[PDB]
Design an enzyme around this catalytic site. Structure first.
Site, PDB file in Angstrom:
ATOM      1  N   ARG A 139       0.811  -1.207   0.000  1.00 25.10           N
ATOM      2  CA  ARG A 139       0.000   0.000   0.000  1.00 25.10           C
ATOM      3  C   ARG A 139       0.851   1.265   0.000  1.00 25.10           C
ATOM      4  O   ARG A 139       0.549   2.222  -0.723  1.00 25.10           O
ATOM      5  CB  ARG A 139      -0.981   0.028   1.175  1.00 25.10           C
ATOM      6  N   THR A 140       1.913   1.275   0.801  1.00 27.99           N
ATOM      7  CA  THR A 140       2.797   2.449   0.839  1.00 27.99           C
ATOM      8  C   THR A 140       3.526   2.591  -0.490  1.00 27.99           C
ATOM      9  O   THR A 140       3.659   3.698  -1.042  1.00 27.99           O
ATOM     10  CB  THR A 140       3.810   2.376   2.008  1.00 27.99           C
TER      11      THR A 140
ATOM     12  N   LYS B 126      21.786  -9.689   4.095  1.00 28.41           N
ATOM     13  CA  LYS B 126      22.798  -9.216   3.174  1.00 28.41           C
ATOM     14  C   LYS B 126      24.204  -9.693   3.531  1.00 28.41           C
ATOM     15  O   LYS B 126      24.548  -9.857   4.702  1.00 28.41           O
ATOM     16  CB  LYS B 126      22.772  -7.695   3.201  1.00 28.41           C
TER      17      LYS B 126
ATOM     18  N   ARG C  30      12.082   1.918   2.239  1.00 29.75           N
ATOM     19  CA  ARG C  30      11.482   1.338   3.435  1.00 29.75           C
ATOM     20  C   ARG C  30      12.340   0.149   3.844  1.00 29.75           C
ATOM     21  O   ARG C  30      12.765  -0.629   2.989  1.00 29.75           O
ATOM     22  CB  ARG C  30      10.065   0.856   3.121  1.00 29.75           C
TER      23      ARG C  30
ATOM     24  N   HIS D   5       8.087   7.377  10.015  1.00 27.22           N
ATOM     25  CA  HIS D   5       7.300   7.143   8.798  1.00 27.22           C
ATOM     26  C   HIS D   5       6.719   8.492   8.393  1.00 27.22           C
ATOM     27  O   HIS D   5       5.499   8.701   8.494  1.00 27.22           O
ATOM     28  CB  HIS D   5       6.159   6.164   9.104  1.00 27.22           C
TER      29      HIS D   5
END
Ligand SMILES: Nc1ccn([C@@H]2O[C@H](COP(=O)(O)OP(=O)(O)OP(=O)(O)O)[C@@H](O)[C@H]2O)c(=O)n1
Ligand SMILES: Nc1ccn([C@@H]2O[C@H](COP(=O)(O)OP(=O)(O)OP(=O)(O)O)[C@@H](O)[C@H]2O)c(=O)n1
Ligand SMILES: O=c1ccn([C@@H]2O[C@H](COP(=O)(O)OP(=O)(O)OP(=O)(O)O)[C@@H](O)[C@H]2O)c(=O)[nH]1
Ligand SMILES: O=c1ccn([C@@H]2O[C@H](COP(=O)(O)OP(=O)(O)OP(=O)(O)O)[C@@H](O)[C@H]2O)c(=O)[nH]1
Ligand SMILES: [Mg+2]
Ligand SMILES: [Mg+2]
Ligand SMILES: [Zn+2]
Ligand SMILES: [Zn+2]
Lengths: 148, 310, 147, 310, 310, 310
Positions: E54-55, E84, E105, E134
């Site tokens: 959604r973001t 990573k 994000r 945020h």
């Protein structure tokens, strides 16, 4: 006088709160019979202003069957009737256990979608009644169990 | 027959003080005098619907120490039947035609209780049902307190850590409250406080309990220091680091401990107990784990054998 | 009369036995403050026995009457005012049935979602077929009713 | 030696009427008089290359009831060797140097047969090979019919559900067709009809069978009502809901059933049998499951022991 | 140039009241008159190291509405490969040679801040870093309040739900505390109360706040009812069920609500807002989501275009 | 405006013959003369809740060929997280505040229809909902037949393969049945026959159809041979092998084929069309896929641009 006439014999549950009569018929499977049943909903009452009323002919309820009404209709009057006369009046009193009709509000309770009947230990508090699930052993306010 | 013969063992709430004492007496006896053929020819199902290696190894070892045979499964989701459609009711109806007792661990509360309704004459032993009960852990905890302290009454018991979500601390508190004169010290961050329903239970029985900010407040008086895991995964990483310091135990904290004091922990421990504690005479968490064998043997023997020869 | 006459409202007569309570439930007839009087398992000259529902100060629209048809196809909906029967209607099969049915297709989007069920109705080979608005699958009414 | 001593048990097609009777007689005997030390010192491999908890628990329990030891694995893919490169041939060549018998379940048809070619003198028992055989399920089914009906001949047997993809119904039909005077009723949606090759087999032996749209058509006459699972995952969700009604059994369907009639189901049941059936005297699916222990014990005893003491 | 030109947008605590008003003014303008080619020839990286459909959809739509091109990825795709090997520093050092801005994000707090240290001239916009910041959610929340209330000062704001772990409510409280005369009402279960470091901040600035156990306590006075989702994780199933009724809104709860009151929710609203609220004039959570487009366009325009949009 | 302007495109059963002809006419025009800027400044959501690389690439290419911008996602990424907490209703309510059209594919039947109920003014195009509808596949199929045959009436159409479970052949049959004089030939194994509700539909309209067990029966008469993939799932391995030769095409099967006959297949064609067909003039499945671009452009243009493209 009477919209729903007197019966010769059977059980009359009077003094049921408005919007509770239908609940009783449903939860306790009261209409699953061939006996004649007459119901009045939203009837006037002196002692409660507005009431429901259920008559079931040639049918009688045990003391705990009446007690299983306690949680929904605590000031109900259960009248036994034969030969047109009220031969007995009784009032629901909180039972020690409530089976079948409640749903455990614990989403992780095993009771959900398993072939068992719900079961709750009953204990009166002060401003509610606590219900403890036989299965998950969690205790809840009756106000939580009864709602969604 | 003994009072626990053919009984289900589901909840600490169903066991009386007399029941607990019987299990513990029987555990001491088997510890002192093993009976490796007691359950010869018995087959026991080890049913871990929820996997738990340590509890399962412990329970299965106890079965073998009494000579029973063991069939079972442990289920991540990898298991045929197995996570899907068949009801637990049906699974138990089937398995209870196979075996002489069912030991089961399950992620849903009430699962062992439901099992008893379908197992016919086959006893069910609850090895953990969600956040509800884990009675054999409590029994091994009790056995360990009794063995090290000589009693289960008039004890000073500190409980430290996640008292809110620890099913083992709730059950242990309930069990000790069946005995007289015990006093509790609860040491936990406010977010993980011992629940009010436990406190109300204590209040009703006139059992003393009090809250404390640190272990040093009560070290001088404690008989049993019961440490619990605090799962980081339900605190903020920052919150945990902010509060861990007062719920972590090191050897240096034990300087004014009584000679009888034992440190218990149901395990795994990660952060809560530093390894320097291990060598102190107070460390008793591995001995506690060891005692699970004897408590679990005692339970199996009592349930599956009418009259304990001893 | 066990359940006396009313002055104004609707009287649903000739409901099959064991269908009166079902109607009260499905169509939420008792979610009202108006006085309701009910007879179940009453003798019936034309039916043997029947159920009976009276709802005061309340009238049913035509499609509301028609929603009864799947459950009480020979019911008689009487409108009453000043104690007089001013109208009689019998349910006709509606062209769509909303809200009360449940799609038998377990993979239908209708199940997990904030929408009302809806089925188109076709009496066809003298079977009644119900087609889901969402999944567009069609089922016997007997299959939809069991679920 | 008995006719099944050291024999492989791979297919119902390889077993004669006499063989089946021997297994069943032996199962009745062990049921009545257990021999918990019969296979003492035997080690049996429980090799579930395809996982099946219920079959495995059943088979391993049978091993333990005769006193044998059990080693094994169950393989999702999680198992070292294990889903990859080594041939089944090599896996069997190795394991057959370890153990006294191999019980194996595998996703490929013919896998147990291939195993016999590499196991040397070690007997292989097929616990299921893809869509081919599952002979011990058939033997437990047969044992259950024989025990409840007193015979395997002149029976009226209804089979209901997915008759097309049920390996257990094919095998049971083949086995009952080794006996005389049986009559079959097949009740299945057209999409899941009993296969033509089974029907041709029946026709050739002059065995009567007929199709029926509902169970009530034949309830009055049935001795055994054998219900199968219908896996939704091979019908359209709409198709399944459209057709389930005629293959679902409820207590009310049993009103005109004969006193001897038993309802069987290899399990798991999900939708096909309502729980209200369970309490009727006709419900026999859990007893059937229970009988798997005795049929599987009988097979192990016969294969691993020359002369059955009884 | 405009005050936010080429600035990083990492934390609400780095944005002044004037900065907030500027973004909102720019958002209002672009909503009234779109500029579909403002960022023509810009390439923007949409880097969702932590997935958020959604973001991400919202942010990318905003990029396109201004005519920018988009490259990017969504992750949690190293599901079992592992974390990573390559540092976030190196990933940013590379990507910042490709694009004109980075929207990112990430599951770890501080990730966007670290990125600014390796991105050289390239602006970094924080789309969420763990439980830290945020900012664009706060910007769209603020824009929505400003639009419906006509101001951001002298408001009565209720926040309901998981106030403890909601990064979104912490940020909105810090943002509204930059304006004057705002009154807060915090409705939360005890286990999920607004943290002390927030209350202390309000106390330093002389801003009134009060705690309430129920929405009805405050309904008649609120201009904004900001609902949050209670994560089932954060609780036990039984605990959640005992508290739920407090933090859940249904249409009947709004009877005494002011005509101007708007109900907001950053979404998803799974349990806490009943669908019957949606058709009330107070339901404004979808309009709120809609405003994400204009808040995010505004931020992109100001950071990447030298001159104020007018 | 044009008849499809701002219309939802959910089901072939909602499109009239005139609607179908309009889409196809528009597709022919855009194929002849591209309009690369027709949808400039439009943002289209490509929402693949169910993943489908080939359908998604085709649809997105069509968007770009008209100059629209694209945002979206492909899913089946809640692989083990679970199904949504958030309703599809809510997802659409949010996304429809972002974009100008929604193209969606979803595993549940009816999903696109439900979306239209929450998308407000925003058109929803169904890229596939379970086993229900897939209208753009039918549109590209129709366009391909029209192009190669010069008409959509009075055709001899053979459909081969899984006619039972192919949503694509059901839709194509319903579409061709809107035109006049078409003749159908259904080639399928018994287990996979064209469903009765289709045959009844053809019967109501007086349209001739016949069943055949083999392609050669009809080869000399067909104008279109529409092949479908037989899903290995839908069958047992042995069953599949027994039937395969019927629903498989090789180049030699085409010896008696009409010069104008085209072989279509919605793809992938893994088994059923041998690669030797590819170089024949009849192979038209890649050209067919190619036509997906023009059918999908046409639909996007008509739904989003007021005036007919000319
Ligand atoms: N043959 C009878 C007798 C009485 N009743 C009903 O049973 C209930 C109780 O009867 P009764 O005690 O006579 O009425 P009340 O005096 O009002 O009793 P209460 O104080 O409980 O209201 C009344 O609703 C009455 O109409 C009945 O249906 N049939
Ligand atoms: N004031 C009234 C009038 C009628 N009724 C009820 O409405 C139904 C039908 O009314 P009516 O036409 O008078 O009865 P019938 O002649 O029996 O009509 P039908 O042939 O439909 O049975 C009956 O149950 C009657 O008791 C009522 O409850 N109140
Ligand atoms: O059996 C009954 C009882 C009551 N009623 C109807 O209910 C209303 C009340 O009739 P009641 O007879 O119940 O008056 P009441 O004063 O006894 O009521 P309570 O305080 O005991 O609660 C009246 O309208 C009457 O017609 C029936 O129709 N049938
Ligand atoms: O309004 C009514 C109607 C009927 N009844 C009761 O139901 C029974 C039938 O009474 P009816 O009046 O309905 O007889 P009927 O011949 O019209 O029957 P139908 O064929 O029309 O169905 C009688 O016992 C009567 O007391 C009521 O109590 N109230
Ligand atoms: Mg009275
Ligand atoms: Mg009448
Ligand atoms: Zn419960
Ligand atoms: Zn549907």
């Amino acid at each position: 006088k009477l919209q729903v006439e007197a019966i010769k014999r059977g059980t009359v549950i009077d003094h049921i709160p408005a919007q509770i009569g239908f609940k009783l018929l449903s939860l306790f499977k009261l209409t699953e019979t061939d006996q004649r049943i007459t119901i009045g909903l939203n009837l006037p009452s002196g002692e409660m202003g507005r009431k429901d009323l259920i008559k079931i002919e040639n049918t009688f309820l045990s003391e705990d069957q009446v007690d299983q009404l306690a949680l929904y209709a605590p000031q109900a009057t259960v009248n036994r009737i034969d030969n047109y006369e009220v031969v007995g009046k009784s009032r629901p009193s909180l039972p020690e256990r409530i089976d079948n009709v409640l749903v455990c509000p614990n989403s992780n309770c095993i009771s959900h979608a398993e072939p068992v009947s719900s079961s709750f230990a009953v204990r009166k508090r002060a401003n509610d009644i606590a219900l403890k699930c036989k299965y998950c052993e969690k205790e809840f306010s009756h106000n939580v169990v009864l709602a969604n | 027959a003994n009072p626990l013969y053919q009984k289900h063992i589901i909840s600490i709430n169903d066991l009386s003080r007399d029941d607990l004492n019987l299990v513990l007496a029987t555990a001491a006896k088997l510890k002192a005098n093993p009976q490796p053929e007691l359950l010869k020819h018995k087959v026991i199902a080890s049913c871990f619907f929820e996997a738990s290696t340590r509890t399962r190894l412990s329970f299965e070892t106890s079965m073998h120490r009494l000579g029973a045979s063991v069939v079972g499964f442990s289920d991540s989701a990898n298991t045929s039947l197995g996570k899907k459609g068949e009801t637990l009711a049906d699974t138990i109806s089937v398995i209870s035609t196979y075996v002489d007792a069912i030991v089961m661990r399950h992620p849903q509360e009430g699962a062992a209780r439901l099992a008893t309704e379908f197992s016919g004459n086959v006893p069910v032993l609850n090895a953990g049902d969600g956040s509800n009960q884990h009675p054999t852990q409590t029994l091994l905890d009790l056995f360990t307190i009794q063995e090290t302290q000589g009693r289960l009454d008039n004890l000073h018991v500190a409980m430290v850590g996640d008292l809110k979500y620890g099913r083992t601390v709730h059950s242990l508190t309930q069990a000790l409250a069946k005995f007289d004169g015990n006093r509790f010290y609860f040491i936990a961050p406010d977010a993980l406080a011992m629940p009010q329903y436990i406190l109300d239970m204590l209040d009703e029985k006139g059992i003393a309990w009090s809250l404390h900010s640190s272990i040093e407040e009560v070290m001088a008086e404690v008989d049993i220091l019961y440490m619990t895991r605090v799962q980081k995964e339900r605190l903020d990483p920052s919150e945990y680091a902010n509060v861990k310091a007062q719920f972590v135990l090191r050897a240096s904290d034990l300087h004014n401990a009584k000679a009888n004091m034992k440190v218990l922990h149901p395990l795994p421990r990660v952060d809560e107990i530093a390894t320097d504690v291990d060598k102190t005479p107070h460390a008793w968490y591995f001995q506690q784990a060891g005692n699970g064998i004897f408590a679990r043997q005692a339970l199996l023997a009592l349930v599956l054998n009418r009259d304990l020869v001893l």
